[PDB]
């Protein structure tokens, strides 16, 4: 097998010339970004994007999250510039996943998820956009942006309404939205959301999630933090809570404590 270092040196020396250098770089790399840069210099943007996807692929595999993020960014830019917003959205969702899990850059992950959902909506792919918006709303609520998360949940509710397939999602959506509105101390908005969900979706009206949301609204109205804790334990006993709900209700309880501090 040829020495990859010698191939890279030959590619650099030659860097039609760009195409040959890119081919040499691809050979050396296969033996093991430069090839994609050379392809861009050659005008073959699609090949550059594919090579960037390959760079992202191996960087993610090598544990190099930063270079993987960079490769995804160049690939996304190339694809978007060529009208392939589908590819851009897929790789933006992957980039947001990388940011959220590997680098913990939650703001950039939120931006990536929002953008991916918007482009998916522009492609009429309701379910992928719905997934991206779920991720975006989850991160936004965890990030202190309760109002925006509730708005995204409203968008999810509107998009999933009338679909027999997303029922369960709706059942949760309403709840989550209300929880966010309750994290923002807007109990009236939470009550409005509960009423809208009860009147619009018969499944949600009789769902345990609706009763739990009503109980939480009542507890915040009476300012009984212990009652809220009891309701949370009762809800956990039948349907396990997730870390998102834990955080929202913890901030809500701390808001009751802040109200108690404000009470003095």
């Amino acid at each position: 097998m040829s020495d990859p270092v010698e191939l890279l040196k030959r590619a650099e020396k030659k860097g039609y010339k760009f195409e040959e250098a890119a081919d040499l770089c691809v050979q050396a790399a296969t033996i093991y970004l430069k090839a994609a840069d050379y392809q861009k210099k050659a005008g073959n943007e699609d090949e550059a994007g594919n090579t960037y996807v390959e760079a992202y692929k191996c960087f993610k595999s090598g544990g190099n999250s930063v270079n993987a993020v960079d490769s995804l960014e160049n690939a996304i830019q190339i694809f978007t510039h060529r009208g392939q917003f589908r590819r851009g959205a897929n790789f933006k969702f992957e980039l947001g996943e990388i940011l959220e899990n590997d680098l913990h850059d939650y703001a950039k992950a939120i931006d990536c998820y929002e953008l991916a959902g918007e482009w998916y909506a522009q492609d009429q792919s309701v379910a992928l956009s719905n997934k991206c918006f779920i991720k975006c709303a989850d991160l936004k609520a965890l990030d202190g942006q309760y109002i925006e998360a509730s708005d995204i949940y409203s968008k999810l509710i509107k998009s999933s309404m009338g679909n027999r397939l997303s029922q369960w999602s709706l059942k949760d959506y309403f709840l989550k939205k209300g929880l966010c509105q309750l994290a923002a101390t807007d109990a009236v908005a939470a009550a409005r959301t509960l009423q809208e969900g009860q009147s619009e979706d018969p499944n949600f009206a009789d769902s345990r999630e609706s009763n739990f949301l009503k109980s939480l609204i009542d507890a915040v109205n009476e300012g009984d933090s212990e009652q809220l804790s009891e309701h949370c334990k009762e809800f956990d006993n039948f349907m396990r809570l997730d870390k998102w709900k834990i955080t929202i209700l913890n901030k809500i309880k701390e808001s009751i404590q802040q109200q108690e501090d404000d009470l003095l």
């Binding site: 109200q259 108690e260 404000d262 009470l263 003095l264």
Partner: protein, 89 residues
């Protein structure tokens, strides 16, 4: 002496009490530019409180404690109407 005082209505924001001592005194803490010292003021034509000069509260804002808000059902940053009060009349 309550004979002479400006009775003009003012719209004031409900804010957190300045400290624990002011809440204990149960006296509406107001700035000197807001109202005179040691006079009775009515709020919403229902809630009467004694004013005390306080330099920590800027003019145009009224301080309340939790019990007063519970009595009036008020939230933080809510706008309330304040006027001079004369119980004797």
């Amino acid at each position: 002496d309550m004979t002479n005082m400006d009775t003009r209505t003012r719209h004031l924001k409900v804010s957190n009490c300045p400290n624990n001592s002011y809440a204990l005194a149960n006296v509406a803490a107001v700035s000197p530019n807001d109202f005179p010292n040691n006079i009775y003021i009515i709020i919403d034509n229902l809630f009467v409180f004694t004013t005390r000069h306080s330099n920590d509260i800027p003019p145009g804002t009224i301080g309340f404690n939790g019990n007063q808000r519970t009595w009036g059902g008020w939230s933080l940053n809510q706008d309330v109407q304040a006027k001079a009060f004369d119980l004797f009349k």
